[PDB]
Amino acid sequence: AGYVSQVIGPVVDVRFDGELPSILSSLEVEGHSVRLVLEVAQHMGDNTVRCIAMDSTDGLVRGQKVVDTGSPIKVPVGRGTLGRIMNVIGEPVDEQGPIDAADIWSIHREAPEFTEQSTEQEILVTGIKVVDLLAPYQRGGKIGLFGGAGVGKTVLIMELINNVAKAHGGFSVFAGVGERTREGNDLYREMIESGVIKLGAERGNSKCTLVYGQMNEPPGARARVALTGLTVAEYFRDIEGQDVLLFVDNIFRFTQANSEVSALLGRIPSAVGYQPTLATDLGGLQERITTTTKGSITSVQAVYVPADDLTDPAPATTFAHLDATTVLSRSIAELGIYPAVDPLDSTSRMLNPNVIGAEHYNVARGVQKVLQDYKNLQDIIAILGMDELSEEDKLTVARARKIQRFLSQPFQVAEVFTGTPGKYVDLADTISGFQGVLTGKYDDLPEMAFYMVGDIKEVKEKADKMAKDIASRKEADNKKVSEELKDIPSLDKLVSEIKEVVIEEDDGLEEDFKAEALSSETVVLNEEGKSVPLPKKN
Amino acid sequence: EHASRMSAMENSTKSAGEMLGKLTLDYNRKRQATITTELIEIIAGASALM
Amino acid sequence: MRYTIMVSATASDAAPLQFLAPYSGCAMAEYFRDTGKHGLIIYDDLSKQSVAYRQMSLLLRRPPGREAFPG
Amino acid sequence: MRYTIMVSATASDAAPLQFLAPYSGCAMAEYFRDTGKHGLIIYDDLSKQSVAYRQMSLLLRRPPGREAFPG
Structure with a gap:
């Protein structure tokens, strides 16, 4: 019912001769290589909406039909998403069939209003000693994880998942916002190995829903994948009545993605370089993580500090929302202490x-x-x-x-x-x-x-x-017996026991190869659209 | 004398750490202000053409 | 709460509401100023009303000044 | 050179060619990735590819962000 008018990078203008879709509504580009979902960002006037794509826009023609779905991006939610991997728009990317949807929920939502909030401010017992004693977790709070590489961050993630599912019976969502695909695959296989994600018929006994928006996805897809993880967590809070765990992996990459989509929509950047709506684009995510009267969502968000500068506006805006920090240290981990929580630099408001x-x-x-x-x-x-x-x-x-x-x-x-x-x-x-x-x-x-x-x-x-x-x-x-002749042979015996491997000087490479012939002439389309040489006069 | 110098260079690294921390904070302020002012210059240049 | 008005434009709310909420609370407390009584008003994080107003101004394409603030 | 391809978009070449040289060299090396073999791609001065892409995007009047770069 609408047609593509402009394609400038990841930013697509669609024109609707009828009535316009709402802002944040999802549009399907009809006819493309892959599923191309756009999200309406603004109404530009003259019956044009301005949209931000969730996939690549290369291969998009002005005049392509675009179907308005009448709603925002809608993702499968429920217990059938456990142990699955979703992208931002709800498709399974774990290659294990479809997703058994209990419901299909809009990812865009207002925060739970004042009458629904909890005034109790109680502690989430996590079963980890250094976390329960020195830096406790608020049930419904946001917790900044200042880990990194080799400090046992992933083991701590999987243990918060394991202990919360074991103790409080709540499920977990991991929102991999802008993570590298090697790290995301490592976390997937490490969750399969540790038993918090099960494949096949035992899939219902998984404790974790992975929602992955990878680093090679466009900025609109990285900016919204935290909301998809939020929607999966909010179903468990509001329908299942659980104490959910949400893991926003690198909240700074959420900030950076929303900054990119704000820069691409032509908005003037605020302080240091960020989006003018930085506090509200962060607070729209963080205020849906709360305790309702039904259950709660407790969020463990990894925090990257940009230039080792805590007064940078992205960590200074994030730290207003945080209720605890658990700083994982390399010096704690090089005393063999696991988990590597720094017991003195970790704080809690609790x-x-x-x-x-x-x-x-x-x-x-x-x-x-x-x-x-x-x-x-x-x-x-x-x-x-x-x-x-x-x-x-x-x-x-x-x-x-x-x-x-x-x-x-x-x-x-x-x-x-x-x-x-x-x-x-x-x-x-x-x-x-x-x-x-x-x-x-x-x-x-x-x-x-x-x-x-x-x-x-x-x-x-x-x-x-x-x-x-x-x-x-x-x-x-x-x-230790036989100082020189227990098992240590002559060095000629040690080279005469290693077996020679086969090396050939024909490297091959013509195994299943097409070998097309490439024309040196430049081949264009005529006005009828057929492949024609160049007309040889300027 | 050697123990007095060990206690005297103990306060010197304390002073050269607190002065360093003040200078690092003020450098972070100047870094943020540099990025903001260069960005405002670029935006004002682009907006005077479009 | 027998004597308190509580005006809240929280972090999820729109930046116009966060810009306007201290003026709303000030109009509510100026009722007690104007009829002879005494009022106490606490604008908690006026540094967040300034950030919401900066958001409104840069989305209105007004020229940013120092730190990005509208002037 | 029995195992090395060289993709060379030099300084005198146009900015879209310097932008597209890492993508073209990655397309040449993904042949070896995709058919079982092993690749080693070296994007020497991805800084200069970034500067070329910034050139094309400022000249297409896309909205500039930090340092002049696109979103």
């Missing part, structure tokens, strides 16, 4: 005694003060000597050295390659455990007693095994 109580608040502030007190004398130990200062200073060294161990915890999705069984730790057990180490009831137990264990009745069994291990050492000796 850490005050009016929401968690004075018991939990004072235990957390004591633990944080003890680790801080150890932290600002390590330039006094390494300079002047280990046993140089007082015994009370070395008492805080030993207590913080064993609390710094005690924050580590074995993870249930990590047991398929580490062997050590993962241990969910409850909140009251975490409080009662760290209070005991803080007063000094465990000053006699070793420092390796507090390592990769669930709660306080496991550090005792760890030390019990370590002191049964004293009596298991006199069972044998240590020796």
Whole structure:
């Protein structure tokens, strides 16, 4: 009912002789290589709408028919999306059939209004000790994850998915906003490997819906894929009544994508370079993540800080919405502590005694003060000597050295390659455990007693095994037989056991090759449209 | 003397870290203002043609 | 809340509503100023009303000044 | 050169050719990717391809963003 009038990059003008589609409505370009969905951005006047494409616009002709769907982009939602991968417009890209839709929901939505909000401000127990104690998660809050590579971020993602599905019975959505396809495939196969995504007939027992808008997609597709993950999460909140987890992977890439679609629609950029609507384009996403009266959505958003500058407007606008940070550190991970949460740079708004109580608040502030007190004398130990200062200073060294161990915890999705069984730790057990180490009831137990264990009745069994291990050492000796002729042969024997592989100097490359003949003449279309040589006169 | 110098260059790195942090914050302000002012120049140049 | 009016244009709301909400609350508190009573008004994050007004101005294509603000 | 293709859009070439040289070289190397073999593509000075694309887009009067670049 409408036809393409302008194609300028990813930005398509469509003309409607009848009535116009609404802003944010979805339009299908009828007749194309792939499914080309446009989203109406503005009404330009003269019966033209201005749209932003969700796929490539190369191959688009002015006058191509465009069908208005009468609604915004509509995605399949429900339990049938679990363990599937969707793109922004709802198509399955995991190549495992269609998506069993419970409903087909519009991705564009107003935030849950004032009467629906929760005034309670309670804590989301996650089963991770360092996360539950020092930087708790608000049920319905937004949590910034300052991880990276090699700090065990993906294991923490899959464990929040696992522990929230195990404890509270809620499902998870992962919105891969603008992620590389190698990283997205790595996370997919690592979720299949860890059992939070199951393929085939066991597909219903998956805990996670992946919504992937990749980095090679146009800016309109990366700018809207977080809303698709939000819609999948809002179905579980509003219909299933669950405590959902949403993972917006790199909220900065959401910001950068919306900045690109604001630049492409010809809007004047605001401060440093961002979209003029940066606070509202971010708040439109973040205000739909809340606690309703039905359930909640808790959002764990990875935050990239642009030039290591926290006063840049994209992290300064994001940090207004965040309720907790969990900074994952490389220096924590190079002490073998997993999860690699920095126990001192992670913050939470939920850490005050009016929401968690004075018991939990004072235990957390004591633990944080003890680790801080150890932290600002390590330039006094390494300079002047280990046993140089007082015994009370070395008492805080030993207590913080064993609390710094005690924050580590074995993870249930990590047991398929580490062997050590993962241990969910409850909140009251975490409080009662760290209070005991803080007063000094465990000053006699070793420092390796507090390592990769669930709660306080496991550090005792760890030390019990370590002191049964004293009596298991006199069972044998240590020796290495046959100093020069156990299995170490002559080097000619070692080169005469390696097998020669086949190398050929015909490299081939003509295996299933067409070998068309390319014309050197330039071939154009005449006015009838047939392939004709160039008319040889200017 | 050596221990007094060890305590004197302890405060010097403290001072050269707090001065560095102030200077890094002010550099971040100048970086943001540079990008904004060059962008406003480019937009004003383009809008005077279209 | 027996004595408080609570005007809210939250982060999801349109930037015209966030630009206008301190003026709405000021008109509501000027009722108490104008009839002899005393009012207290708290504009929480007037730095966000300025950002909403900057959004409105750059979407109206008004020339940005310092930091991008309309002047 | 028994294994190397060279795709060379030099400085005297037009800006659309410098824009399209990495895409054309990637299309030549995707032959080896797609038919089982292994490729190594080297886009030397993707900075200059970026400058060429900025040239074409400012001359097509697309709206400029940061430093002059398109969206």
